[model samples]
Target: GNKYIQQTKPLTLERTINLYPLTNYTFGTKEPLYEKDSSVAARFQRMREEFDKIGMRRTVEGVLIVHEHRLPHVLLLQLGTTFFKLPGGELNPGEDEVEGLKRLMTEILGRQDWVIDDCIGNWWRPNFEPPQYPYIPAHITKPKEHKKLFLVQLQEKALFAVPKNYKLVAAPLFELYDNAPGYGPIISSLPQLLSRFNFIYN
Candidate 1:
């Protein structure tokens, strides 16, 4: 097998997959999704730089948490019960997308133990669109990495923490969409959030 050219077959891009089971919208009290290490700013700058690049293709990866035997529990980087974001970061120079993503995950989540799995799908920023991915929040300003979504492996464990920030939110996936109760202005732009789950599953 030629490692470079003749790789194994890749996962088929599916139109749809397991939608959901009986709903269980009971994520009671929400916590302040924490974030606020020094890197946040650097990432912003890096994102801007990446976006600013003339016409170079870019790649980054992230995880979208959905339970195996349970309803999809979406995790977001929350701020005061309002804004929520998919947690991810840019890859290091020449670093493998998934490998860098998993490494970044371990760093941010502060846990060395995790199960990183298949990619959900990759989304493009619709060429010539300098910035502003309407599928995300306005505060994000520059959503660089019009990138790939990493699939999650849910497990039982005490949550991870940072310093002074809201941390993360575990809300029902549909709660953020499908009329989205009161989750607007926060998670406003989101045509790509938990989308393409089928693309990777199939």
Candidate 2:
């Protein structure tokens, strides 16, 4: 009960986010990674094809957090130049949220004992385009994609086998705040979403 505290109020979304010390986590380079699609155009082509079959895209992403220097840092995968994303991907037709996210995490970070027990937030893509909002716009009748973000709980100490091609960077909350130009809207708005958490130093 001491580790975290939360309040339950009607029509209000309140949650408890547990963050452990950063030193408990470690990372190492693994084999070079490969994407399902070879090119950006090819990737979208597949999305369009899958969208035709699956209706709306149900995507899941992990919000891995660790405490460092008395601040919480988010683990993000950095790609060529400036692109950064959380470790997650598309789910199969029948695959559920938690299990599918676990599969994707293992695929990218290698098998580990991390626990994902809580979903901190969700976002919606109004269209096939890049724009996404925390809340659905009133004018939109149907959303194209629904993305869910989960909290990954790390053990006391664990090794992460990061893919060679992408670098895993632990970015502090301050660095991502109002940084849409750097981390995009979804990631840049983390500070706002995470404000409800009562973090512990450990």
Candidate 3:
């Protein structure tokens, strides 16, 4: 233990995290879904617009884990050729985090039977830029955005209706580990962040 370095808390809980086989879930396509803003500039413009009204941006994402070939897989929504992200969105003013996540899940995945009780990790954005770190930097005073990652448990069997504009893929843990170029920091670092869970695959 080095005294010079900062001591931080663990990201994930040291508890059993039940995971099901990939075959237990089915995937289908639904109607096309569009974002609030058409362009990236417009997206940040809206964020700036809302930031002035509602403090920091509170965003949530759900990590649905499934097992295949004796390893864990995370469900990711893919748009275009390289963009992949978890199923979730921004929370409205005065809305509860978990409840907001549930609402976003239904809006994106088209389901209401989601059981999201555990939050595995959290990331903070010091600025409006794309860089998001697990812990806020010592130099930064106020964070611009705070994103939370929740572990969503699925029933024994269920069908997910994905948006037609996107493609859903079950990416194994190894594929995302240390692959920042492929998936972003939040998605790539999932394997390390989720290492604390005791997974029970059935």
Among all candidates shown, the one with the greatest TM-score: 3
Per-prediction TM-score to the true structure, in the order listed: 0.53, 0.85, 0.89
Best by the lDDT measure:
3
Could you give candidate 2's per-residue lDDT for residues 155-192 as a string of tens digits? 66678899889988899999999999999988998888
Q: What's the lDDT for candidate 1?
A: 0.50
Candidate 1 scores a C-alpha RMSD against the true structure in Å of 9.2
> Global lDDT for candidate 2?
0.83
Which pairs of residues have clashing backbones in candidate 2?
none
Over the stretch 1-202, how does candidate 3's per-residue lDDT look in tens digits? 6577655545343467678888988878888888778887897888788888898999999999999977999999998799898999999989999999999999999843489878889999898777889998998888889999999987777799889998889999999999999998999999997887888887
Clashes of each: 11, 0, 0
Cα misplacement distance, residue 188 of candidate 3 (Å): 0.2
Per-residue alpha-carbon lDDT of candidate 1 for residues 95-202, written as tens digits (9 for 90 to 100): 777777767665555532345666555554543343424355545544444666666554433345432354555666556565444665224223355555542221
Off by over 4 Å in 2: 1-18, 38-40, 111-113
Task: Name the 10 consecutive residues with the lowest summed lDDT in model 2.
Answer: 9-18
The Cα local distance difference test for each model comes to 0.50, 0.83, 0.88
Query: Which lDDT value does model 1 have at 107?
Result: 56
